[PDB]
Enzyme design. Structure first.
Site, PDB file in Angstrom:
ATOM      1  N   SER A  94       0.901  -1.189   0.000  1.00 62.52           N
ATOM      2  CA  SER A  94       0.000   0.000   0.000  1.00 62.52           C
ATOM      3  C   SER A  94       0.909   1.199   0.000  1.00 62.52           C
ATOM      4  O   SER A  94       1.841   1.252  -0.819  1.00 62.52           O
ATOM      5  CB  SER A  94      -0.992  -0.074   1.215  1.00 62.52           C
ATOM      6  OG  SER A  94      -1.500   1.149   1.739  1.00 62.52           O
ATOM      7  N   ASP A 215      -8.758  -5.897  -6.278  1.00 62.50           N
ATOM      8  CA  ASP A 215      -8.241  -4.998  -5.211  1.00 62.50           C
ATOM      9  C   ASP A 215      -9.037  -3.707  -5.269  1.00 62.50           C
ATOM     10  O   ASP A 215      -9.014  -3.026  -6.262  1.00 62.50           O
ATOM     11  CB  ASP A 215      -6.717  -4.725  -5.373  1.00 62.50           C
ATOM     12  CG  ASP A 215      -6.139  -3.832  -4.234  1.00 62.50           C
ATOM     13  OD1 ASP A 215      -6.820  -2.902  -3.740  1.00 62.50           O
ATOM     14  OD2 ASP A 215      -4.984  -4.072  -3.810  1.00 62.50           O
ATOM     15  N   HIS A 244      -7.045  -6.665  -0.951  1.00 62.10           N
ATOM     16  CA  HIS A 244      -5.987  -5.643  -0.854  1.00 62.10           C
ATOM     17  C   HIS A 244      -4.985  -6.030   0.255  1.00 62.10           C
ATOM     18  O   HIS A 244      -3.894  -5.477   0.296  1.00 62.10           O
ATOM     19  CB  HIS A 244      -6.651  -4.281  -0.545  1.00 62.10           C
ATOM     20  CG  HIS A 244      -5.682  -3.151  -0.382  1.00 62.10           C
ATOM     21  ND1 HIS A 244      -4.731  -2.827  -1.344  1.00 62.10           N
ATOM     22  CD2 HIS A 244      -5.527  -2.252   0.632  1.00 62.10           C
ATOM     23  CE1 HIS A 244      -4.028  -1.789  -0.922  1.00 62.10           C
ATOM     24  NE2 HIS A 244      -4.504  -1.407   0.259  1.00 62.10           N
TER      25      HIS A 244
END
Ligand SMILES: CC1=C[C@H](O)OC1=O
Length: 265
Positions: A94, A215, A244
């Protein structure tokens, strides 16, 4: 030095191969706990919490400093320097995938390999660019994060996890709810502001882009975009599941990709 303490830096395992686990938005280093025993035999593992994690004292958060991802890169580098690690593989989820890309450009001597999970160079759409998000969309999210943070966090968690894996939902919720709401919105604004498209060719490290089958923040086409624009030798490794946060929702399968990606660097 003070950072070592402030960011809860831990060094576990052993080996000539050092790896850094750098977590993403809404978790802290504990999100790596399931994959961690697969790496402990073969590697010396460095773990730390981002200054915005709920597990770090929120009064450390300097809102002007962390206006920009460079300041998170500063911390990562200061951590590695404090430990006198002159080379390592880096695994970033991320926002930390963005942090790792910047760090590897600032210090190419330091990053022998990147492994990028839930990664994007830019979330906003653009004429020929599919980021997955329009300005009104994010702004609605910023507005919910301020209006009612805990409701937003309750609605976001299942979507981040993606698959119906209640244990991962609950665990992602716990760290999400642990973030100070003003910090959380601040980081989310910083991330959604960021655009790394232009600097991707500056990365020299080999890189592995981990793609799941869906995602919420990373459309399908982004991985092939990273592969075609990162400036080192890049492959895209595929997980047979969605979400995710695969290190929470499919840790065994992720551990497979990590062992392979971390074999040689
Ligand atoms: C992917 C995404 C939507 C959410 O509500 O906040 C986010 O970062």
């Amino acid at each position: 030095a003070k950072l070592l303490q402030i960011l809860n830096v831990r060094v576990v395992g052993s080996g000539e191969r050092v790896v850094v686990l750098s977590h993403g938005f809404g978790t802290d280093q504990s999100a790596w706990s399931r994959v961690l025993p697969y790496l402990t035999r073969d590697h010396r593992v460095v773990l730390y919490d981002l200054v915005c994690a709920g597990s770090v004292n929120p009064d450390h958060f300097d809102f002007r400093r962390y206006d920009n991802l460079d300041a998170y890169v500063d911390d990562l580098l200061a951590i590695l320097d404090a430990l006198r690690i002159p080379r390592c593989a880096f695994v970033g989820h991320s926002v930390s995938a963005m942090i790792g890309i910047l760090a590897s450009i600032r210090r190419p001597d330091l990053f022998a390999k990147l492994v990028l999970i839930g990664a994007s160079p830019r979330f906003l759409n653009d004429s020929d660019y599919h980021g997955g998000f329009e300005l009104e969309e994010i702004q609605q999210v910023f507005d919910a994060m301020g209006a009612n943070y805990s409701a937003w966090a309750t609605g976001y968690a299942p979507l981040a996890v993606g698959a119906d894996v209640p244990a991962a939902v609950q665990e992602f919720s716990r760290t999400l709810f642990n973030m100070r709401p003003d910090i959380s919105l601040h980081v989310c604004q910083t991330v959604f502001k960021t655009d790394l498209r232009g600097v991707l060719g500056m990365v020299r490290a080999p890189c592995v882009v981990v793609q799941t089958t869906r995602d919420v923040s990373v459309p399908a086409s982004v991985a092939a975009y990273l592969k075609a624009h990162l400036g080192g030798r890049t492959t895209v490794e595929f997980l047979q599941t969605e979400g995710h946060l695969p290190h929470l929702s499919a840790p065994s399968l992720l551990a497979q990709v990590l062992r392979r990606a971390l074999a040689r660097y």
